[PDB]
Design a binder for this molecule. Structure first.
Ligand SMILES: *[C@@H]1O[C@H](CO)[C@@H](O[C@@H]2O[C@H](CO)[C@@H](O[C@@H]3O[C@H](CO)[C@@H](O)[C@H](O)[C@@H]3O)[C@H](O)[C@H]2NC(C)=O)[C@H](O)[C@H]1NC(C)=O
Ligand SMILES: *[C@@H]1O[C@H](CO)[C@@H](O)[C@H](O)[C@H]1NC(C)=O
Ligand SMILES: *[C@@H]1O[C@H](CO)[C@@H](O)[C@H](O)[C@H]1NC(C)=O
Ligand SMILES: *[C@@H]1O[C@H](CO)[C@@H](O)[C@H](O)[C@H]1NC(C)=O
Length: 375
């Protein structure tokens, strides 16, 4: 069985922070921590009031002159568990059941004879940022893959979920063909948002608290806007129709060609700058150049377009299309398009009735993985 590298999506791996802040927004916020502590996921930090301290620490500060993000003053952040799997398996380490993500898949791999940190390793990253600001991650990824090839005597299978697929595609596009041919056995793509997703618009406009219902959407919106990864996942014209209307308000429409207006109108000009920085990172048409298995969920209502009665401080009415609940079905066209441009094999696999996250622990998904690894 070949070695395996797991790549998480947005919000998909733990993050740690250390504090020595000059000042804070409220007296009850900690100025200093003695060591690094879990910033994501920690449910205790997401309660009302305390949320303001958390936002103050986890937000990214955009420098308009340098066109780059910085951490808040006195705040440092690291990605734990690179080369291990604990940070991908459970999001909140203290809070077992509720935070289960990659756990089920990893347990199955172990059942088939794999070993944590050895045959199977995770590649977590700072998912708040785009690939442009995770250069070190990609260096470590390349080196880890080479090490696993040497140790275990064979090329690696990449298994990526959601945004992890875009990160890994960027990575693969930048490696020479000879390297990919030697070191990569296959790339298993799970729920990949090729060409962005509709839900991005709602998040940016009015906030999205589906997971965190105890907190108001307009409060959490502040943090969500700050993450470059959010703006990076706005719909792209090669997958969606250039004329498709995503957002309707009482005064105006918004298509994918109206992002500048959108950002100005919602009062977040930084987001336009973020989008300009990142929209050109991944070459739309260039395939990864390796054996690809594209798994996508269907039959789950997925937000397609939005009507705002009041813009942008009031929650919108939502029209639904097909997909996995998060990633729109229309994303799977890119895999379809790559199939016709094939040196390497491209296999498409529908997962009817499988939700975006549930697919990672689904028996059918695991059975397909078995096929790839042992066949
Ligand atoms: C955003 O990032 C930019 C670029 O890194 C920062 O630019 C700052 O600009 C000042 C001058 O306006 C820099 O000071 C000058 O440095 C040059 C050497 O290149 C020297 O010849 C001058 O005498 C002067 O000292 C400053 O170094 C630089 N600030 C930095 C690097 O922190 C800008 O400050 C950043 N903005 C924020 C809010 O972080
Ligand atoms: C999509 O956007 C890019 C960048 O603006 C542009 O080069 C390309 O022509 C666009 N596709 C269209 C207009 O169909
Ligand atoms: C958006 O465009 C469509 C098609 O041109 C039009 O029917 C509609 O009136 C527009 N919506 C708004 C809110 O202006
Ligand atoms: C797994 O997928 C099957 C069919 O693909 C679906 O019927 C089922 O609801 C899913 N179950 C879980 C636990 O994800």
């Amino acid at each position: 069985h070949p070695p395996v590298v797991l790549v998480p999506g947005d919000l998909g791996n733990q993050l740690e922070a250390k504090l020595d802040k000059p000042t804070v927004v409220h007296y009850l916020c900690s100025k200093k921590t003695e060591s690094y502590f879990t910033i994501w996921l920690n449910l205790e930090l997401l309660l009302p009031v305390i949320i303001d301290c958390w936002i103050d620490n986890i937000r990214l500060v955009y420098n308009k002159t340098s066109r780059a993000t910085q951490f808040p003053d006195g705040v440092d952040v690291r990605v734990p568990g690179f080369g291990k799997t604990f940070s991908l398996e459970f999001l909140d380490p203290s809070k077992s059941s509720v935070g289960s993500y990659f756990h089920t898949m990893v347990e199955s791999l172990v059942g088939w004879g794999y070993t944590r940190g050895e045959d199977v390793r995770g590649a977590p990253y700072d998912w708040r940022r785009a690939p442009n600001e995770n250069g070190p991650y990609f260096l470590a990824l390349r080196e880890m893959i080479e090490e696993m090839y040497q140790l275990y005597g064979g090329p690696v299978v990449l298994v990526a979920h959601s945004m992890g697929n875009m990160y890994t595609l960027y990575f693969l596009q930048r490696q020479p063909q000879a390297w990919k041919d030697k070191y990569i056995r296959a790339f298993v793509s799970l729920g990949a948002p090729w060409g962005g997703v509709a839900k991005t618009l709602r998040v940016l406009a009015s906030g999205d608290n589906n997971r965190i219902p105890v907190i108001g959407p307009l409060k959490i919106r502040e943090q969500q806007r700050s993450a470059v990864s959010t703006s990076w996942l706005l719909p792209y014209n090669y997958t969606w129709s250039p004329e498709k209307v995503f957002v309707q308000t009482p005064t105006i429409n918004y298509t994918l060609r109206d992002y500048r207006k959108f950002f100005q109108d919602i009062g977040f000009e930084d987001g336009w700058l973020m989008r300009q920085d990142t929209e050109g990172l991944v070459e739309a048409t260039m395939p990864p150049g390796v054996q690809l298995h594209c798994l996508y969920g269907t039959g789950v209502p997925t937000p397609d377009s939005f009507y705002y009665e009041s813009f942008p401080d009031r929650d919108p009415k939502i029209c639904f299309g097909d997909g996995d609940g998060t990633v729109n079905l229309k994303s799977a066209l890119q895999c379809q398009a790559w199939q016709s441009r094939q040196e390497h094999q491209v296999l498409l696999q529908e997962l009817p009735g499988s939700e975006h996250i549930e697919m990672l622990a689904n028996a059918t998904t695991l059975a397909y993985l078995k096929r790839v690894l042992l066949g």
